[PDB]
Design a protein around this ligand. Structure first.
Ligand SMILES: [Mg+2]
Ligand SMILES: [Zn+2]
Lengths: 17, 99, 153, 101, 288
DNA sequence: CTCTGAATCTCTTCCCGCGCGCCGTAGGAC
DNA sequence: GTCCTATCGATCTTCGGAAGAGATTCAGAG
């Protein structure tokens, strides 16, 4: 999900891009 | 009643439901909302892909748990693919996309 | 002049539809309103449609629908069902008056204890009006001969 | 329904009778009526060959290939009986020809 | 397959043929005594996939050593049986058929595109009245539905300078004649012609639908089904129950009805049945 | 003569689990 | 008995939902 730890993962993916 | 592993339904590979059948508890929509209320995303992903739906994944999870690795390979919930066929059986062309 | 009219009928009960119309015409003594009722059949041209030589009176319109296993006629509107045509009757009467088992082809049987089994043509019993098709019995998948009626193509 | 005839041919008496017993017993068990076995006359070829590679015309060997024939007639077949017969496999080297009607 | 987006759009008939691995013809699934799947049925082994785990139906091969090969005793391809739940088939309808959803949504998309009332389009589709297309040198409008008595008038008043079809055929011809972009431009300039908000709002809806169809790769005739794909059988199992019987399956019976009706229509069209009979068969097929 | 009002049409919707327990193609032709 | 085809192709499928929303008609309305 794009929330919580899932939001952390998505945010890392978007920042490393 | 408690279930570790047993019968799996045919049309969708989710575990059976009931006591007279070796079935597991249903994780309703309210429970999903409650999990989303916390930041638990790995818990939800496991609960709705490995434990219940992804046929290939739930065996690879079994080996790791026996091996003591405690790592999951989610893949994709098989039931979802079934949905696609039900829509692809109509005059609708719905498909996954790369980008 | 009694134009033909086409009537819907219970498939499988079509002969009973024709008979039940034949009785009701005489019982209601409307013999002067019906000429013939056609159910063409070959060794059935129209699977579930009955042709009736008739005129168009409201009494006849309700009489046909008063026969069992009859919804009604097929036409443009329910108020006035329509005849078929001039030449259509003639064509239907014209018809009412008027495949090789290739070696190697994979067949299925039509009757017998071996009916509907995956066989494969093995030889040609042609001038006998017969057949011979290999099948998979007791590992000794045996050279097995069949009647010509036992093909399924 | 026409009866089905099974003609078994083999070079061995005991093997052919074992296969025949299997077939008839299966047919009886699966509720078919079977009129068999019938021991049809057994062919016996013969061959006489010189055993001496050169001359010695009187030294010979006579050999024989005995071919045994058994007939099993199954009258009034049933789908159940036919399926049982199909799933029953017979000893190899025993030829079976099925005539139908 | 890894993915990042989901796209939904209309499916062209050739796309449906691309989906399919075979054409289901015989409306039979399995024997009532033996449990083998009947070929060219709703459960055809060579169309959707083998039933055995890694063995062909014909039994010619029972090993991974022959995986991926094609048998010639039954025609079934030997592979993983799981594929049987993913392969689809298709039924080529003997005549066009309108997609029910697009016919009777909250508005009528098919009706909205042609600006034709839902009642009248349903009347046309269910073979109740004619509709004149390509009317040419006749006092017959672009669509201008007309009844059989009205059609009986046009049959002799005019010759072949007009065309009036019935059912989904007329709607498909109208859709195939839709000059979509020119129509949208004309309507978007006609919007400024009048201040009738009661009609301006639905005109805005119509032009929005036209713009959505123009921008998307969708084409109008795709609202009319011509090939109907069949669901993979493993998603609609005919599971047995206690004793030698199979549990009833809802989708299987609907497909059986459709296949039987379409085969009857094909048989008649081969035998040149009268217009009344073929019209009734086409209506029954559409309703099935 | 239609327009821009209402009024009268059809369609969609209605908590979560959990257990029992039955009950589950039909008539007609060779 | 088996196995077949077809499915109110001569009835009336229920009246003890409410509402809420559109969509579709009409109606004085100028
Ligand atoms: Mg001899
Ligand atoms: Zn095979």
């Amino acid at each position: 999900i794009p929330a919580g730890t899932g939001y952390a993962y998505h945010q890392d993916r978007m920042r490393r891009r | 009643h408690a279930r570790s592993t047993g019968s799996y339904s045919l049309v969708t590979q989710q575990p059976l439901g009931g006591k007279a059948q070796f079935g597991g508890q249903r994780f309703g929509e309210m429970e999903v909302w409650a999990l989303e209320a916390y930041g638990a995303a790995y818990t939800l992903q496991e609960m709705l892909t490995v434990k219940s739906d992804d046929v290939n994944g739930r065996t690879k999870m079994y080996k790791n748990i026996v091996d003591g690795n405690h790592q999951m390979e989610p893949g994709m919930p098989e039931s979802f693919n079934v949905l696609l066929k039900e829509i692809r059986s109509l005059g609708i062309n719905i498909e996954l996309e790369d980008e | 002049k009694k134009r033909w009219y086409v009537v819907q009928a219970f498939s499988g009960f079509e002969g009973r539809v024709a008979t039940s119309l034949r009785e009701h015409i005489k019982l209601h003594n409307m013999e002067d309103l019906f000429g013939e009722v056609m159910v063409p059949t070959e060794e059935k041209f129209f699977p579930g449609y009955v042709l009736v030589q008739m005129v168009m009176n409201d009494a006849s319109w309700h009489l046909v629908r008063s026969v069992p296993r009859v919804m009604g006629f097929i036409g443009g509107t329910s108020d006035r069902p329509a005849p078929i045509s001039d030449k259509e009757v003639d064509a239907i009467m014209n018809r009412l008056q008027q495949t090789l088992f290739e070696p190697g082809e994979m067949v299925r049987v039509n009757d017998g204890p071996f009916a509907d089994f995956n066989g494969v043509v093995e030889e040609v019993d042609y001038e006998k009006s017969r057949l011979k098709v290999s099948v998979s019995i007791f590992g000794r998948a045996t050279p097995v001969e069949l009647d010509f009626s036992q093909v399924e193509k | 329904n026409q009866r089905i005839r099974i003609r078994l041919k083999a070079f061995d008496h005991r093997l052919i009778d074992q296969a025949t017993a299997e077939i008839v017993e299966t047919a009886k068990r699966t509720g078919a009526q079977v009129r068999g076995p019938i021991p049809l006359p057994t062919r016996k070829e013969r061959f006489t060959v010189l055993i001496s590679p050169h001359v010695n015309k009187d030294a010979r060997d006579q050999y024989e290939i005995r071919t045994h024939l058994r007939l099993v007639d199954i009258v009034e077949p049933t789908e159940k009986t036919v399926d049982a017969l199909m799933r029953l496999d017979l000893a190899a080297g025993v030829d079976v020809q099925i005539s139908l009607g | 397959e890894e993915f990042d987006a989901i796209k939904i759009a209309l499916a062209s008939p050739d796309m449906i043929r691309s989906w399919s691995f075979g054409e289901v013809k015989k409306p039979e699934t399995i024997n009532y005594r033996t449990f083998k799947p009947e070929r060219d049925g709703l459960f055809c082994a060579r169309i959707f996939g083998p039933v055995k785990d890694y063995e062909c139906l014909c039994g010619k091969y029972k090993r991974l050593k022959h995986r991926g090969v094609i048998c010639e005793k039954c025609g079934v391809e030997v592979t993983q049986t799981k594929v049987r739940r993913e392969r689809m088939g298709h039924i080529e309808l003997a005549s066009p058929t309108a997609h029910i959803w697009f016919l009777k949504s909250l508005p009528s998309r098919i009706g909205l595109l042609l600006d034709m009332p839902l009642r009248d389009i349903e009347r046309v589709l269910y073979f109740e009245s004619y509709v004149v297309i390509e009317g040419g040198m006749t006092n017959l409008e672009r669509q201008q539905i007309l009844t059989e008595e009205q059609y009986l008038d046009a049959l002799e008043e005019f010759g072949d300078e007009f065309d009036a079809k019935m059912g989904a055929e007329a709607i498909q011809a109208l859709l195939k004649s839709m000059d979509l972009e020119q129509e949208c431009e004309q309507l978007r300039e006609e919007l400024n012609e009048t201040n009738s908000e009661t009609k301006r709002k639905k005109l805005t809806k119509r032009i929005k639908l036209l713009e959505a169809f123009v921008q998307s790769g969708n084409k109008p005739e795709w609202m009319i089904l011509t090939v109907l794909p069949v669901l993979p059988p493993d998603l609609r199992p005919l599971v047995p129950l206690d004793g030698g019987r199979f549990a009833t399956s809802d989708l299987n019976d609907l497909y059986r009805r459709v296949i039987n009706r379409n085969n009857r229509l094909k048989r008649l069209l081969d035998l040149a049945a009268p217009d009344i009979i073929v019209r009734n068969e086409k209506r029954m097929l559409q309703e099935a």
